Amino acid sequence: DKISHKIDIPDSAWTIGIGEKFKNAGHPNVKYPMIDDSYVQGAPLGGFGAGTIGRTYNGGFSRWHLEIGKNKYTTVYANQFSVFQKVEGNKDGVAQVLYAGEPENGYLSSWKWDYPKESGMYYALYPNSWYTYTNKDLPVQLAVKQFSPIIPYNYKETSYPVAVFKWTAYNPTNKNVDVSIMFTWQNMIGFFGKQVNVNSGNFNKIIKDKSKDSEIVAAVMGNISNDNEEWNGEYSIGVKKVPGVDISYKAKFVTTGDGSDLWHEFSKNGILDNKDDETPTKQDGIGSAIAVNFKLQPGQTIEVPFALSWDLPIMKFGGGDKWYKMYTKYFGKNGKNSFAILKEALNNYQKWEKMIDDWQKPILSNKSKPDWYKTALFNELYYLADGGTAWENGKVGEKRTNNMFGLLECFDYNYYETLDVRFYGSFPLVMLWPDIEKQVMRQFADTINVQDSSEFKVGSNGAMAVKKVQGMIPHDLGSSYALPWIKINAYDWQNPNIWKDLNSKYVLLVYRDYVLTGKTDKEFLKYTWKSVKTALDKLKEMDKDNDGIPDNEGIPDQTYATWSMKGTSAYCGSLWLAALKAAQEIGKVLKDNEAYIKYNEWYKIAQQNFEKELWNGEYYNFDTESDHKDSIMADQLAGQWYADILRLGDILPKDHVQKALKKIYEFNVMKFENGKMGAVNGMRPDGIVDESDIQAQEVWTGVTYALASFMKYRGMTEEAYNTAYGVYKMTYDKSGKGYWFRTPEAWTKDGNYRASMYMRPLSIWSMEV
Numbered sequence: 001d002k003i004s005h006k007i008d009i010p011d012s013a014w015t016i017g018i019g020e021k022f023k024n025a026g027h028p029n030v031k032y033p034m035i036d037d038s039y040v041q042g043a044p045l046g047g048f049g050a051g052t053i054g055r056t057y058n059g060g061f062s063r064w065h066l067e068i069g070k071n072k073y074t075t076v077y078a079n080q081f082s083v084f085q086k087v088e089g090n091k092d093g094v095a096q097v098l099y100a101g102e103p104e105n106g107y108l109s110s111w112k113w114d115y116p117k118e119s120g121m122y123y124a125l126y127p128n129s130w131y132t133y134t135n136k137d138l139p140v141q142l143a144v145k146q147f148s149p150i151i152p153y154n155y156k157e158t159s160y161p162v163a164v165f166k167w168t169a170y171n172p173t174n175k176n177v178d179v180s181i182m183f184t185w186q187n188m189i190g191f192f193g194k195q196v197n198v199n200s201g202n203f204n205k206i207i208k209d210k211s212k213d214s215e216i217v218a219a220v221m222g223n224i225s226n227d228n229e230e231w232n233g234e235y236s237i238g239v240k241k242v243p244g245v246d247i248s249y250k251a252k253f254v255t256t257g258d259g260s261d262l263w264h265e266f267s268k269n270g271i272l273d274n275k276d277d278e279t280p281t282k283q284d285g286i287g288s289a290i291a292v293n294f295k296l297q298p299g300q301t302i303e304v305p306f307a308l309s310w311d312l313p314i315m316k317f318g319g320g321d322k323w324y325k326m327y328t329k330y331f332g333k334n335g336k337n338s339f340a341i342l343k344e345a346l347n348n349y350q351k352w353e354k355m356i357d358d359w360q361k362p363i364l365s366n367k368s369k370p371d372w373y374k375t376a377l378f379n380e381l382y383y384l385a386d387g388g389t390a391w392e393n394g395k396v397g398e399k400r401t402n403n404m405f406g407l408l409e410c411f412d413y414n415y416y417e418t419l420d421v422r423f424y425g426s427f428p429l430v431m432l433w434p435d436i437e438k439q440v441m442r443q444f445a446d447t448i449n450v451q452d453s454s455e456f457k458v459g460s461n462g463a464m465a466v467k468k469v470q471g472m473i474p475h476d477l478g479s480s481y482a483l484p485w486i487k488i489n490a491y492d493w494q495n496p497n498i499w500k501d502l503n504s505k506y507v508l509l510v511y512r513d514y515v516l517t518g519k520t521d522k523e524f525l526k527y528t529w530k531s532v533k534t535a536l537d538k539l540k541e542m543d544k545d546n547d548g549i550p551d552n553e554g555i556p557d558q559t560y561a562t563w564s565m566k567g568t569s570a571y572c573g574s575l576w577l578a579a580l581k582a583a584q585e586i587g588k589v590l591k592d593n594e595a596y597i598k599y600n601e602w603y604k605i606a607q608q609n610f611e612k613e614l615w616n617g618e619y620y621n622f623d624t625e626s627d628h629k630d631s632i633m634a635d636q637l638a639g640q641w642y643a644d645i646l647r648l649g650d651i652l653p654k655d656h657v658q659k660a661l662k663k664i665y666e667f668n669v670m671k672f673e674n675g676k677m678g679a680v681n682g683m684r685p686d687g688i689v690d691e692s693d694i695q696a697q698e699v700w701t702g703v704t705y706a707l708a709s710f711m712k713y714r715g716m717t718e719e720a721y722n723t724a725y726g727v728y729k730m731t732y733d734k735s736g737k738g739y740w741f742r743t744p745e746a747w748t749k750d751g752n753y754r755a756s757m758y759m760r761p762l763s764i765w766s767m768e769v
């Protein structure tokens with residue numbers, strides 16, 4: 001491995017061998033159907049709202065999120081990098097596809113498949129990933145750095161449907177070596193969004209752009225149609241010329257054939273025919289090929305950049321709504337702009353690299369933090385781009401001031417911006433992309449007073465209920481199978497209009513966003529104030545016994561729905577206390593003196609009653625009226641956790657909070673599988689897991705990272721990192737269950753999971769407040 005010294009892979013990068021098998025991978029622990037795409041994953045490529053492409057550690061372009069809100073796992077085998085090498089003075093060379101595997105069907109059989117094991121590594125520190133190629137039969141060693149320009153406080157490049165592949169090649173041998181690197185890409189127009197004739201009209205063309213300081217050669221893969229539809233647009237691949245390399249290309253080869261039309265050229269001398277065949281296809285799959293060839297003298301290094309772009313301007317949801325994607329603001333909406341995007345990337349990727357280094361460096365250079373934590377902190381951010389992200393730039397067939405945004409809860413539970421989940425999972429947005437965060441919360445503000453009197457069938461019991469109640473915050477802002485932003489509350493399994501935590505979390509989220517963006521944005525507080533007051537006032541009406549706190553009703557009425565709460569609960573109670581104190585402070589800032597006085601009286605009354613009803617001398621009871629009331633909940637003081645973040649001070653006595661957290665650490669962590677798997681949600685005071693409901697027996701990844709941050713703020717440094725460590729281990733480590741780049745909501749004692757690719761674990765960013 002002489003190539004690793006010649007590139008800058010950080011030590012915290014997640015690593016695995018190319019072609020490595022993994023023996024202990026977990027699977028779903030529920031009886032209903034649930035996604036399991038295996039452990040062959042990688043860091044995604046593509047910006048926010050662009051649609052993402054998951055290239056795996058084996059090198060395949062396999063996890064497709066280009067259809068916004070859908071997860072499609074299938075390797076498009078034609079999409080590859082391939083290498084040709086010949087030692088100078090030798091008659092023949094070798095050619096090899098850089099993919100640890102082979103096609104299932106008989107297509108592309110003439111290509112050299114099955115990149116051997118123990119011959120290279122994959123590395124990932126999102127948004128960067130790397131492949132190294134160190135193979136006995138390849139004299140020249142190769143590495144590629146691949147990324148998309150995901151940059152905090154940048155809402156432009158961060159949106160781009162683009163990837164850069166910066167190759168580095170080094171000759172450690174005593175002889176000159178001829179080397180070719182080739183990028184193949186299938187014309188994927190019609191891969192989604194066409195019932196019939198999936199390839200028909202597809203055509204490829206070569207573009208050459210020589211502009212003194214920059215020669216670029218690119219294949220543009222489009223369609224003859226000018227239909228402005230979900231499926232139509234362009235993919236492009238290309239390369240920038242550098243000193244000492246020459247470029248060759250093949251505009252059209254058949255992907256639904258044996259491949260020899262391309263391979264017989266490339267495997268001969270690593271040089272292609274430069275044939276520019278623009279004729280459309282009818283039934284055959286087609287693709288393009290871009291290759292560079294060069295000669296490396298002994299000890300010589302060369303760097304050559306490739307790029308990939310996809311101009312697919314329109315997203316369509318299942319309800320029929322068609323929206324333009326965010327990036328269209330910068331490149332246009334007509335779907336004929338893939339080359340412009342690619343050219344931007346090939347001429348600016350070095351700037352983008354430095355911008356990425358600039359925002360990672362403060363964390364990476366802090367040597368007081370262990371590398372494992374950085375691996376998790378950065379790689380968890382995969383979900384921002386990969387979570388079915390929707391970022392609109394106008395509805396198809398119409399100007400507008402704001403660009404609505406949606407991140408999914410997950411693909412199995414296909415709901416945009418699920419509020420109770422985003423309470424934990426929105427930390428990276430507020431901290432790194434605050435304008436997006438604020439926009440999402442204004443979307444929620446705008447839903448508060450919406451009334452939908454028509455009824456729906458509640459799935460868990462069968463009872464009918466009102467869709468959307470005035471003054472109650474929605475569970476979500478819709479589904480990709482229906483109408484995001486328009487038809488809210490797509491979730492019907494329970495009735496969110498009776499939930500006791502959503503209104504509180506909403507208020508806490510509003511004030512969080514003000515506090516963590518510098519306490520300067522009064523306009524944001526003004527925009528949201530009516531909704532805040534309404535939300536707390538409607539929740540006050542659910543106080544039955546007149547203790548000043550909303551009553552949980554012993555039925556599904558909060559986040560932990562099936563692990564029911566009754567009476568005053570630690571969870572909803574603490575959130576209520578914190579929300580009231582947050583409302584007080586907004587009151588003071590906006591000079592709404594009556595609101596201030598009101599919420600202050602409500603706060604003091606509820607605070608006293610909370611302490612009296614729930615403090616047992618060691619921790620806070622789960623609730624007042626359940627069968628499982630003395631259970632130790634991991635999330636018992638969620639309100640106080642947010643109050644620390646919001647700099648709202650002590651809603652509960654310091655001494656009591658400290659004891660509760662020590663108890664949670666002693667029990668929920670260290671008495672659950674030796675504290676190597678996170679915090680189990682519920683534990684009985686006898687040191688046995690609360691078995692009243694499945695949820696209680698689950699570790700929730702995002703709850704645990706949140707709990708770690710809470711411990712950290714309260715000076716429990718060792719406990720915080722030990723708690724978080726178990727979540728890292730399960731996700732990323734060889735001893736875990738192989739959930740890298742698909743971190744689930746939950747696992748049980750056995751390490752099997754529920755709901756892979758989940759928003760909540762983004763809560764790890766709360767540890768950086």
Ligand SMILES: OC[C@H]1O[C@@H](O[C@H]2[C@H](O)[C@@H](O)[C@H](O)O[C@@H]2CO)[C@H](O)[C@@H](O)[C@@H]1O
Nearest residue numbers: 409413415418420421491492493559745
């Ligand atoms: O995991 C907590 C999370 O649950 C989500 O509801 C799931 C539920 O967990 C599952 O048991 C059921 O079969 O499916 C529903 C989705 O329809 C819920 O969306 C979240 O609010 C909650 O945080």
Ligand SMILES: [Ca+2]
Nearest residue numbers: 543549550551
């Ligand atoms: Ca009450």
